[PDB]
Design a protein around this ligand. Structure first.
Ligand code: HEC
Ligand code: HEC
Lengths: 125, 125
């Protein structure tokens, strides 16, 4: 869906920006600094679900650019493992949110954040 | 969820960028220049559904900035009517996609695009 590589870069950056707002805006809730409304969080995690599936298709072959370390395309199976592990940790966060189980939410949130950081460490310039 | 107004600007711009990729990538399909796969389009419109609900919350009071004409906050009911009409045209596009009805897709797509342009004309700098 991208006319030039720059379009893929702009798309993924925008997806990651959201996806990151929808994750990070829950930090006060997970820390207890903001109240926990199970329905609010269930709805927000559903948005995060959808967003978390979007960036990866915008790292097609030859869409090198942005802050994407070059190691992303030449090690394709390994980058895919990281996105799919991230994506699997998001399933666990959805399960916690859907259940209204705060303790499960906090644990799952930490796992998700570790998965963000793991990819950032291997693949962000 | 925004620490400063600039954060809201960055969020809405990113949401609008996606939302706009998910809309515009269907143009070749609506024109018949690309094949029509009903399931593909149903799934893409579902993504567009979700995205099309996101920008509006990032135009809170005092988040002036970006390419958002100042007329957005002082005429709040009217800006809300435009986003909700856009949002209603998206419901019609979902219905067309869900039904696998190509003719209904083309008509709904044109209505959506007109709603994008109408808001762009009243509120984009
Ligand atoms: C888990 C919820 C997160 C969060 C909060 C973020 N990421 Fe990543 N990310 C990855 C790569 C390769 C990039 C660079 C993209 C490019 O510039 O081409 C990024 C970038 C970001 C950003 C900045 C986006 C921007 O506006 O420029 C942010 C805010 C961000 N990330 C947060 C790679 C990955 C992953 C590889 C599988 C995973 C998982 C994540 N990121 C997860 C997260
Ligand atoms: C219907 C599907 C669309 C499409 C394809 C786009 N919009 Fe809009 N849009 C609106 C405003 C106020 C702005 C400025 C935001 C800001 O800068 O603060 C925009 C911006 C955009 C962009 C550019 C985003 C960026 O990266 O800077 C794009 C690509 C875009 N729009 C496309 C306002 C509205 C609406 C008011 C209710 C509606 C409806 C739409 N836009 C709809 C669409």
């Amino acid at each position: 869906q991208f006319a030039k590589p720059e379009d893929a870069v702009k798309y993924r950056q925008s997806a990651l920006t959201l996806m990151a707002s929808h994750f990070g805006r829950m930090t006060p809730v997970v820390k207890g600094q903001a109240p926990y409304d199970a329905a609010q969080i269930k709805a927000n995690v559903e948005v995060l679900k959808t967003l978390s599936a979007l960036p990866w298709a915008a790292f097609g072959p030859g869409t090198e650019g942005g802050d994407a370390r070059p190691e992303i395309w030449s090690d394709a199976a390994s980058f895919k493992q990281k996105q799919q592990a991230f994506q699997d940790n998001i399933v666990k966060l959805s399960a916690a949110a859907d259940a209204g189980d705060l303790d499960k939410l906090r644990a799952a949130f930490g796992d998700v954040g570790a998965s963000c950081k793991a990819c950032h460490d291997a693949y962000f310039k």
